[PDB]
Structures are given as C-alpha cells and as structure tokens.
Design an enzyme around this catalytic site. Structure first.
Site, mmCIF file in Angstrom:
data_model
loop_
_atom_site.group_PDB
_atom_site.id
_atom_site.type_symbol
_atom_site.label_atom_id
_atom_site.label_comp_id
_atom_site.label_asym_id
_atom_site.label_seq_id
_atom_site.Cartn_x
_atom_site.Cartn_y
_atom_site.Cartn_z
ATOM 1 N N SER A 75 0.602 -1.089 0.075
ATOM 2 C CA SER A 75 -0.203 -0.313 0.021
ATOM 3 C C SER A 75 1.056 1.117 -0.065
ATOM 4 O O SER A 75 2.112 1.917 0.942
ATOM 5 C CB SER A 75 -0.876 0.123 1.346
ATOM 6 O OG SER A 75 -1.685 0.558 1.218
ATOM 7 N N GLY A 76 1.023 2.265 -1.082
ATOM 8 C CA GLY A 76 1.019 3.572 -0.395
ATOM 9 C C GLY A 76 2.865 3.584 -1.797
ATOM 10 O O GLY A 76 3.570 4.154 -1.933
ATOM 11 N N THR A 93 -0.883 2.545 -8.467
ATOM 12 C CA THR A 93 -2.099 3.365 -8.824
ATOM 13 C C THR A 93 -1.427 5.042 -9.779
ATOM 14 O O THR A 93 -1.937 5.150 -11.003
ATOM 15 C CB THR A 93 -3.461 3.838 -8.342
ATOM 16 O OG1 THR A 93 -3.462 2.721 -7.621
ATOM 17 C CG2 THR A 93 -4.376 4.800 -9.153
ATOM 18 N N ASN A 101 -1.584 6.014 3.016
ATOM 19 C CA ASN A 101 -1.995 6.410 1.899
ATOM 20 C C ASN A 101 -3.690 7.205 1.863
ATOM 21 O O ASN A 101 -5.138 6.040 1.473
ATOM 22 C CB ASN A 101 -1.997 5.247 0.286
ATOM 23 C CG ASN A 101 -2.341 5.761 -1.111
ATOM 24 O OD1 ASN A 101 -1.831 7.455 -0.863
ATOM 25 N ND2 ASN A 101 -1.927 5.194 -1.962
ATOM 26 N N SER A 115 -5.549 5.481 -0.937
ATOM 27 C CA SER A 115 -5.473 3.806 -0.977
ATOM 28 C C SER A 115 -6.378 3.237 -2.166
ATOM 29 O O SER A 115 -7.688 3.878 -1.814
ATOM 30 C CB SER A 115 -5.481 3.392 0.025
ATOM 31 O OG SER A 115 -5.620 1.839 0.029
ATOM 32 N N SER A 116 -6.353 2.566 -3.043
ATOM 33 C CA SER A 116 -7.178 1.688 -3.662
ATOM 34 C C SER A 116 -8.173 0.457 -2.992
ATOM 35 O O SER A 116 -7.463 -0.472 -2.206
ATOM 36 C CB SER A 116 -6.288 1.155 -4.907
ATOM 37 O OG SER A 116 -5.875 2.084 -5.972
ATOM 38 N N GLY A 140 -0.606 -5.831 -3.454
ATOM 39 C CA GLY A 140 1.075 -7.347 -3.740
ATOM 40 C C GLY A 140 0.850 -8.116 -2.053
ATOM 41 O O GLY A 140 0.230 -7.744 -1.125
ATOM 42 N N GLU A 157 1.377 -8.045 1.584
ATOM 43 C CA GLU A 157 1.600 -7.221 2.559
ATOM 44 C C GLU A 157 1.208 -8.590 4.108
ATOM 45 O O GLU A 157 0.253 -9.048 3.877
ATOM 46 C CB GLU A 157 0.981 -6.295 2.297
ATOM 47 C CG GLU A 157 1.728 -5.121 3.603
ATOM 48 C CD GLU A 157 0.429 -3.818 3.242
ATOM 49 O OE1 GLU A 157 0.829 -4.092 1.811
ATOM 50 O OE2 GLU A 157 0.974 -3.136 3.853
HETATM 51 N N1 LIG Z 1 5.892 9.027 -9.545
HETATM 52 C C1 LIG Z 1 4.815 9.427 -8.209
HETATM 53 N N2 LIG Z 1 5.156 10.715 -8.140
HETATM 54 C C2 LIG Z 1 4.895 11.215 -7.539
HETATM 55 N N3 LIG Z 1 4.434 11.156 -6.536
HETATM 56 C C3 LIG Z 1 4.034 10.075 -6.563
HETATM 57 C C4 LIG Z 1 4.538 8.853 -7.407
HETATM 58 N N4 LIG Z 1 4.197 7.259 -6.921
HETATM 59 C C5 LIG Z 1 3.262 7.943 -5.516
HETATM 60 N N5 LIG Z 1 3.286 8.916 -5.216
HETATM 61 C C6 LIG Z 1 2.873 8.892 -4.008
HETATM 62 O O1 LIG Z 1 2.652 7.979 -3.590
HETATM 63 C C7 LIG Z 1 0.988 8.009 -3.494
HETATM 64 C C8 LIG Z 1 0.626 6.809 -3.203
HETATM 65 O O2 LIG Z 1 0.843 6.386 -4.811
HETATM 66 P P1 LIG Z 1 -0.168 5.058 -5.560
HETATM 67 O O3 LIG Z 1 -0.031 5.032 -6.299
HETATM 68 O O4 LIG Z 1 -1.661 5.445 -4.337
HETATM 69 O O5 LIG Z 1 -0.234 3.799 -4.233
HETATM 70 P P2 LIG Z 1 -0.471 2.410 -3.999
HETATM 71 O O6 LIG Z 1 -1.462 3.010 -5.802
HETATM 72 O O7 LIG Z 1 0.589 1.434 -4.285
HETATM 73 O O8 LIG Z 1 -0.815 2.237 -2.933
HETATM 74 C C9 LIG Z 1 0.317 8.927 -4.058
HETATM 75 O O9 LIG Z 1 -0.558 9.742 -3.403
HETATM 76 C C10 LIG Z 1 1.122 9.806 -4.516
HETATM 77 O O10 LIG Z 1 1.516 11.647 -3.303
HETATM 78 MG MG LIG Z 2 -3.503 2.075 -5.464
#
Ligand SMILES: Nc1ncnc2c1ncn2[C@@H]1O[C@H](COP(=O)(O)OP(=O)(O)O)[C@@H](O)[C@H]1O
Ligand SMILES: [Mg+2]
Lengths: 154, 779
Positions: free
Chosen positions: B173-174, B178, B220, B223-224, B446, B448
């Site tokens: 997570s985070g 996404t 996050n 979070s998705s 993934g 966790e």
């Molecule tokens: N490539 C990136 N550029 C800028 N900020 C990012 C990037 N990847 C992640 N972040 C930051 O981290 C947070 C988590 O990203 P996210 O893709 O939602 O995590 P996941 O989908 O893996 O749970 C986002 O809200 C953003 O603020």
């Molecule tokens: Mg997500």
C-alpha cells in the site's frame, strides 16, 4: 657438450673470462651480475637461494658449478617481462592515456620490493626515462621498452 | 509542468566523477548487516580464522564472521541503470544501488528483466510530453530507466511479434502502483492516438473509479480499495481501438464503517463539498457530514485534498464518458441514499421486541431518492415476507435484525453501483472497431503482512502466490533466452512443491476457501466452528498450514497461519462467514426492482426478487476472476514493475532500510535475482575483465584479437576448470568463488612484479657495466 646447447656454454665461457679467473672463478657476490651478463634478470631473493653472497671473497663459484645455476634461472618462465610491467604501471595510469607520475614510480622503486639505490634509479631514469611534462607525468611505455631491451615497442 | 527532465533521469557527469572516487579496495571493502541501515560499508582491518575486524566510518569497529560479509561493487557501477550489470548482486549491493539512485532523484531502476520503482513522494517533470517524446521508438538500453521505456517496448513487441502484452504493477500500500498505472495508460493513449475522444475517455475513468473506489488510509491518502485490470486494445495499425476494465474485491465494509484515522470513499465527501450546484439539494443532503454515521466514524478530511475540486473533476468525467444527465444524477441520488439509510433510527415495541421506526425523516429521504413508497419501504424492512411454496409469511424483526439489514443494503447498493460504473465505462470504451491486440495493465495490492490479516489479506496473498508462480516461470524462460543471446546454453527448471503447496492449501477441495464455502451453508457456525474445522483438517497434515503465532501486547489472537513464499502470515477469521455471504432482504430488493429510480433497477437487475439466488459467494466469485485473470496473463508477454514505498512518513528522499529490504523480499525482487544468477553469481563485461585481470596473462591476452578469446585464454592460463565460467558474446559468467580465486592469483602476481621490475632494472644496469668491463678486457 650435448646437454645444454653448445653456443650457450660458449656464452658462459666468455662471461667467466671477463668477470672471473681460471683457477677460482667468479666471486659469489658477482653471481647475479654474471647471470645478468647472460641476458637474465633474476631477483635478489633468487640469487640468495642459489649461492649469492654479500661482500667479496666469501665464496667462489667455478664454471661447472655455475652452469646448473644458469640453466635453473633459464628454466623458470615467469620472472617478469615488458608486458608484465605494462600491467603493473597501468595501475598508476589514472588518466588511461599511458602516463603516470614520475614521483610515484620513483617512490615505488625505492620503497617497495627489492628496493633500489638512489644511484641505481638516477642512472636508470637518465638513460631510459623521457623528460617529465609540466604536471610531472611521464610515458611509462617507452621507459620499460628501453629497460627491457624491447625496440619493437618504441 | 513544462521543464527539463534530464536532471531527473540521468546521473550527471559531475556526479559520476565524484562517484568514481569513492573509497574502494577490492580486498577490504565489505558490506556488513545493520539493524537501522540494513547494511553498512566497512573496511576489513584484520582477519583471524573466520572472524574479521571491520572498520566503519566513524571509528567504530566490529568483529563478525566472514559468513556475514557481502562483496562490494567498485565505484564505476555506482547508480547503475541496470543492476544485472553489477558483478555482485547480493542483497547489500541491490539496496545500495537503489537507495543511491533514489537519493539522486532517480525513481526507476532496471534489474535485468524487470523494473523497480521507488515512490518519490514529490512531483518530478518526468511524465510530460517532452519526456514521453524521449522514449517513443527508443530501445530500453538507449535511454535512462523509466516506466515509459517498458510501455514503449511492450507496444513495440506487440506490433512486431503480434502478441498481447501485460504490465503487472505490484507492491504494498502506498508504493505507487496507481500513479504508475495512470501514467502507463496515458502513454498508450498518446502513442496510440489516431489523430469525447477515446484517448481522453480512457484517462477520464480514473476520477470516477477513484471517487467511488479509493479512500484515505494511514498508509495512503488515496488508497485503492479495489484491484484493477485494464486492457488497452489496439487496431491492426497500432492505433487506439478501445479498452475494458475489470475490478476485484471492493471493500464493502468501508461504506458503513471506518477506523479512527481513515475515511470512507472519497465520493461521500466530494458530494458533501457542495462544489457542484444542485447536487446536495436533489439529494436532500445537509451541510454537516457528521449527520451521517456511516461515513463520519473516522477522519472526514484529508490534508492537501480539495474534495470540492475533486467532485467537479469527477462530475466532469461522467460527461466526457457519456453519462446521460439522468444517469449521472441517479448515481448521486443512490450515493446519498446510502448515506441517509445510516440515519434511519428504530426502537423496540414489546412482543418479540419487534422493532418500529423512530422517526421517518431520513427514511423519507431514502424513499424519494430510490423512488420507492416510504410506507411500503419501512414495511418490507420491519415485516418482510418469505415464500414457503405458494404462500406469504409476515415475519417480524427486532431492532438489531433491522439495523443489520440496513447496513447490508448500504453495502449491497454501493457495491452494485460501483460495478455498474465499470460496466458503463466499458460500454463507452467499446467502439466496435477492429481490435487486433491489447496491452493489459494490472493494478492490485501486492503481498503484505499487517498486524491484523483478515479475509481480504488472504485473497490478496493468494492472488500474489499465483502471480509469483507466474513470475518465477517467466524469469526462467526469459533468462534462458538472455543466455541464448550471449551464445550460452543455460538450463535451470526446478519447480519446488511450495510454489503450489500454499495455492493448494487455499484453493484445492477441503482447502481454506472450500471450508469457508462449505461452512457458509450451515446454521450458525459462527467463526469458532470455521476455526476448528480449519485446524482439525490441516494442522499437522498440510505442510504450509501452521499454528498461529501468539499475539503481542495490543494484538488480537490469530487462528491459523500460512508459510507464504514471502513469509509467515497469521490470519484472523472473525467475520469471514459474514463477509463471505452478503444476504439482502429479498423483499426490499424486489421493491427496488419495481421502484421509480431507473438506475436502481439496473444495478439490481442481476439480483432476483422473490443468477439471483443461488450457491455463489464472495470467495467463489473471486476465484473465477483470478482464474480468468491468470489465464489472460499467461497468454501474454508480461512485464514486471515492482513498486516500493521508501518510508512510512510520505517523506521524499528518506529511505527506511528495514522497510525497503522487507519489500525486496516480498515483491520478488530478490527472488528474481536468485533465478537470473542461478549457477553463475557473478558476471563481468570484457573491458572490465581486461582492466582487472590482464595482469595475470598479459602477453597471452595481448595476442588475442577479440575480447572473448582473450578472456578465455586468460582463464585457461590460470588453473581454472573450463566449467567454472562461460564465455558469452559480450560477458563472462563465473560460478561461485571463481572471482575469489582470480583475486588471489592477482594478489600474488601483483606482489611479485615489483621485484621482477627491479630485477630487470638491475639487469639493465648490470649489462650496462658489463660492456665497459668487457672492452677493458682486451690487451
Ligand atoms: N511517481 C510518483 N510521483 C509523485 N508522487 C507519487 C508517485 N508515486 C506515488 N506517489 C505518491 O504516493 C501516493 C501513493 O501512490 P499510489 O499509486 O496511490 O499507491 P498504491 O496505488 O501503490 O497504493 C500518491 O498519492 C502520491 O502522492
Ligand atoms: Mg492503489
């Protein structure tokens, strides 16, 4: 007569006629210089291991006693060469251009391994070494080619 | 954000020259373990037996076993773009290369066949059109690491090889799944653009799905709460032709329950912002979020997030995606209806503590929004009816049974509403034009390990168990190809049972899920009967099945454990049966299907009134999805992007070594390395081989014209068995301990040349004087 090549024995004959006397031979302190006169380059440690002696008149080595030592030194293959020394000095060629600092070379020769005298290095540089540049660098390839008698690399 | 992306993609020439002067001795430099830093660079000060004294920066010295030391790559490999080029790829060298690059603002790093992406937590100008143009058409090795490089490569392989592609973006997570997912999709929408454009409609799916599917958690802020698999279809000429989306395991409970530090779904707060005229009025929504208990149990705002600006964007997306006004407005109605239902209070009466409405204020709002008769609605909730065969029954309900029926309906409506949004997006994105190939993008949680691992964590870790098996298989095949490219035959196949043992424990008959479904059709069986039926059936009988690890202070006990590929996880089963079967008041559903809300009838068009009512469950439904997904993935050429969270504080540039290392183990980065390096831990390009080991056989190597033969004859010269290495077209591969022997040969040889050189200098000086002494020996 037919064990060690004939001409090579004759080469040993000529050196003994120059450095030693018929009755005695070459003084053991000259054992290294004799082998060097035969186009060999043994290390001081190897000369000690084969009858080398410090000071004069401590030991004499006659002809037939010197020949096995000659063939010995001529058997061992890896005693150094121009190509071997190029790789050692490459470890100082920071710029990958075939140069190193003459200070580092002089320091290493006088400090490491079977170190050399101040006089031995000055003469060596006088004959084989090229003049430095503004920054103190020197081309080490031609220096080794002259010291190792390698005209093909000049 | 038009800037220059160069300083965020490359290592500067200035930085490179600095890196090439870091303090390296091939004999002393070593990595040692450390709690907080994971690994520390050290200097072997002395060795006695199998114990070494390591000098650390700062004066500290430690005595530890040689076993624990790991080799260090020389400074020329600093911040390497592709870690497969490193001579040593031990755990310490992997962490080091990645953290150094991260500290240099470099998000992406290649590790042979897959790519690593560390969350920057800062917005760098590497996703602009200017940056995208840099990767179009270029090969992966012609440009710095980037997600665009992988995307382009897959688009190129698709068009050249006529094979569907896959991009699996995984991590905890985070980690950034996404974000990277949305950038990949936007890249394919750009390159595939032929010229309400299809290219913009695919991107506009995110504000909708994220509004209803994402929520703020401690890890996050966005979070998705669902998994996602999107296929971007391309026509025969490589132009965008369409797309479709599949979602998995939407967290229903968040609709009616939140932890203190978390939010419900963004949409509930977006709609309450009032940034869209008419919405709150149409929905009878007050201006106090806390008037709705289902949504205000935890946090109600997110720092740096403007729910008002987000609602406008989301509302705008519906328009671009082609949502009619009636459709859009009913989505808001149903959404607010879910909020209102949580306010419908009740009270007891007397006999059988049969409940009755305590205020119809909120109930009336729900009825009007759902287009139902308020009187009939309360009647079907309090006095539902069942069929024995050809008769009705006036069954009663107490306050608690009624309360729980409400929460169930809240979860059922929102879940079905979410599914419909996805269905509606797929209709918009189906242009009935020729679809030749597709590139599928996976965005799912993934493996966790939390403190509390429940039903969801089991499905996720089960999913990743299958993704890892797929990954391992592909690594063997592709690496075998990589060796073939180097002119080497490489064969390593072994499939250990454990790759399928856990999957069997979970999926096979009488497994974890089988028992969960078997037990779902029994009278009560509340938790404890499911728990014991799991132990009696598997503990001591199924290898991976283990006793639950006792809880530490502040933790609820667990009921069983699984030795997963990435670690031992203790699972808590309370509430699984409830979560596995989501039964709804069939009488109220029938009323919905007969209501005046056209959308409400649609989202329930699946559910029968009095498929519809069969033997299906959450676990059963998801197992078919996962089978459908794995079938699709194995039909494609996959590409693996491993996302990694650097720290727990959302801080850019800060690396929590322990946290990162855990992910490298769980996200399969270290596993993939073991595979690619199996049999030959170390490799080395020929220019580096010559620079380092030509001193062993200079004259020999000097003769050889091609590097290959030079390296080979050099290894033959020393006492090396020809099976201890492989001569590739551009690389030498070494079995374990060979470089150690090569370094010993080099050390001894290097310890002699200085004497040889001096012996030769004396020979020259001697032969110099022998000429004078010679001529002086005449007459
Ligand atoms: N490539 C990136 N550029 C800028 N900020 C990012 C990037 N990847 C992640 N972040 C930051 O981290 C947070 C988590 O990203 P996210 O893709 O939602 O995590 P996941 O989908 O893996 O749970 C986002 O809200 C953003 O603020
Ligand atoms: Mg997500």
């Amino acid at each position: 007569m037919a064990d060690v090549p004939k001409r090579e024995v004759e080469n040993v004959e000529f050196v003994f006629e120059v450095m030693g006397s018929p009755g005695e031979g070459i003084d053991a302190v000259d054992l290294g210089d004799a082998l060097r006169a035969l186009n060999l380059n043994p290390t001081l440690a190897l000369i000690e291991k084969l009858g080398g002696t410090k000071k004069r008149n401590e030991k004499k080595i006659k002809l037939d006693e010197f020949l096995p030592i000659y063939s010995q030194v001529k058997k061992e293959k890896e005693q150094g060469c121009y190509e071997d020394f190029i790789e050692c000095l490459k470890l100082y060629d920071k710029e990958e251009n075939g140069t190193m600092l003459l200070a580092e070379l002089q320091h290493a020769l006088l400090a490491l391994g079977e170190s050399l005298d101040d006089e031995q290095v000055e003469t060596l540089f006088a004959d084989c070494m090229d003049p430095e540049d503004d920054e103190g660098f020197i081309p080490y390839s031609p220096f080794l080619a002259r010291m190792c008698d390698r005209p093909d690399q000049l | 954000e038009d800037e220059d992306p160069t300083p965020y993609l490359f290592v500067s020439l200035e930085q490179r020259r600095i890196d090439q002067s870091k303090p390296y001795d091939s004999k002393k430099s070593c990595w040692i373990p450390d709690e907080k830093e994971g690994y520390l660079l050290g200097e072997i000060k002395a060795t006695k037996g199998d114990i070494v004294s390591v000098g650390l920066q700062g004066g500290e010295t430690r005595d530890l076993k040689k076993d624990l030391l790991q080799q260090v790559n020389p400074p020329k490999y600093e911040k390497a773009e592709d870690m497969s080029n490193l001579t040593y790829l031990n755990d310490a060298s992997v962490l080091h290369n990645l953290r150094q690059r991260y500290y240099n603002k470099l998000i992406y790093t290649y590790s042979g066949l897959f790519c690593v992406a560390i969350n920057p937590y800062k917005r760098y100008p590497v996703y602009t059109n200017r940056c995208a143009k840099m990767y179009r058409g270029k090969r992966r090795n012609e440009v710095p690491p980037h997600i665009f490089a992988i995307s382009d490569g897959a688009y190129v392989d698709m068009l050249t090889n006529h094979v569907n592609q896959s991009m699996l973006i995984t991590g905890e997570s985070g980690a950034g799944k996404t974000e990277n997912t949305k950038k990949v999709i936007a890249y394919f929408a750009t390159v595939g653009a032929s010229k309400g454009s299809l290219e913009d409609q695919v991107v506009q799916t995110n504000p909708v799905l994220e509004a209803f599917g994402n929520a703020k958690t401690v890890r996050n802020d966005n979070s998705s709460r669902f998994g996602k698999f999107i296929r971007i279809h391309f026509g025969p000429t490589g132009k965008l032709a369409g797309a479709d989306i599949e979602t998995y395991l939407l967290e229903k409970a968040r609709v009616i329950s939140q932890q203190s530090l978390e939010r419900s779904y963004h949409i509930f707060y977006q709609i309450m912002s009032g940034s869209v005229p008419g919405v709150k009025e149409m929905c009878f929504l007050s201006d106090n979020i806390y008037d709705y208990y289902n949504v205000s149990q935890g946090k109600v705002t997110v720092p740096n997030m403007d729910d008002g600006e987000e609602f406008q964007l989301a509302d705008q997306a519906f328009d671009i995606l082609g949502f009619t006004k009636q459709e859009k407005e009913d989505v808001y109605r149903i959404t607010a209806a879910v909020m209102h239902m949580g306010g419908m209070k009740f009270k007891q009466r007397g006999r059988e503590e049969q409940a009755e409405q305590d205020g119809e204020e909120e109930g009336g709002r729900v009825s009007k929004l759902f287009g139902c008769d308020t009187a009939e609605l309360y009647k079907n909730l309090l006095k539902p009816r069942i069929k024995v065969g050809n008769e009705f029954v006036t069954q009663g309900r107490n306050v608690q049974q009624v309360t729980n029926s409400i929460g169930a309906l809240c979860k059922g409506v929102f879940d079905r509403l979410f599914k419909w949004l996805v269905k509606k997006c797929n209709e918009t994105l189906d242009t009935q034009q020729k679809r030749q190939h597709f590139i599928g993008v996976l965005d799912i949680a993934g493996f966790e390990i939390f403190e509390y691992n429940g039903f969801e964590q089991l499905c996720i870790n089960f999913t990743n168990e299958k993704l890892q098996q797929f990954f391992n298989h592909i690594m063997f095949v592709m690496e075998q190809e990589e060796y073939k490219k180097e002119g080497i035959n490489w064969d390593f196949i072994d499939f250990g049972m454990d790759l399928l043992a856990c999957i069997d424990l979970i999926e096979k008959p009488m497994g974890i899920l089988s028992i969960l479904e078997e037990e779902s059709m029994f009278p009560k069986a509340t938790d404890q009967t499911f728990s014991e039926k799991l132990t009696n059936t598997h503990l001591g009988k199924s290898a991976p099945f283990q006793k639950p690890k006792p809880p530490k202070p502040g933790q609820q006990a667990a009921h069983f454990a699984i030795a997963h590929y990435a670690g031992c996880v203790s699972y808590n089963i309370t509430g699984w049966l409830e979560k596995n079967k989501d039964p709804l008041n069939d009488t109220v559903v029938d009323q919905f299907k007969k209501s005046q809300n056209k959308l409400l009838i649609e989202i329930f068009a699946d559910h029968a009134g009095q498929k519809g009512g069969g033997f299906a469950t959450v676990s059963s439904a998801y197992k078919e999805q996962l089978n459908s997904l794995m079938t699709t993935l194995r039909s494609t050429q996959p590409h693996f992007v491993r996302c990694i969270i650097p720290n727990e504080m959302k801080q850019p540039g800060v690396v929590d070594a322990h946290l990162v290392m855990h992910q490298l183990t769980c996200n399969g980065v270290l596993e993939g390395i073991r595979i690619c390096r199996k049999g030959f831990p170390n490799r080395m390009m020929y220019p580096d081989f010559k620079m380092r080991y030509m001193i062993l056989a200079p004259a020999i190597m000097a003769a050889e014209k091609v590097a290959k033969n030079a390296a080979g004859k050099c290894l033959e010269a020393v006492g090396l068995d020809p099976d201890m290495y492989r001569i590739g077209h551009t690389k030498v591969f070494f079995r374990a301990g060979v470089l150690g022997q090569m370094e010993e040969f080099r050390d001894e040889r290097l310890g002699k040349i200085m004497s040889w050189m001096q012996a030769w200098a004396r020979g020259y000086l001697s032969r110099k004087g022998f000429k004078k002494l010679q001529e002086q020996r005449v007459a």
